[PDB]
């Protein structure tokens, strides 16, 4: 038998018809893998932060 083993010919053509596209960026990236101790605490700081801001607006209504 015996055939072609390997070639990257035509592979950059195929990647550039519709790809080699940069991913979109968002204001909030996903926090997967950030330290758990900080992430647990970041929950309490934000919930408490929301409490303070909620009261400031409830006064101003």
């Amino acid at each position: 038998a015996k055939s072609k083993n390997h070639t990257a010919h035509n592979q950059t053509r195929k990647a550039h018809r519709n790809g080699i596209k940069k991913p979109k960026t968002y204001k909030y990236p996903s926090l997967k893998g950030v330290d758990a101790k900080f992430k647990r605490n970041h929950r309490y700081a934000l919930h408490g932060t929301a409490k303070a801001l909620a009261k400031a607006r409830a006064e101003k209504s």
């Binding site: 195929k14 790809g19 080699i20 596209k21 940069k22 991913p23």
Partner: peptide, 9 residues
């Protein structure tokens, strides 16, 4: 890091 894998990053 954004790494190229085929037709996307």
């Amino acid at each position: 890091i954004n790494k190229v894998v085929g037709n996307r990053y």
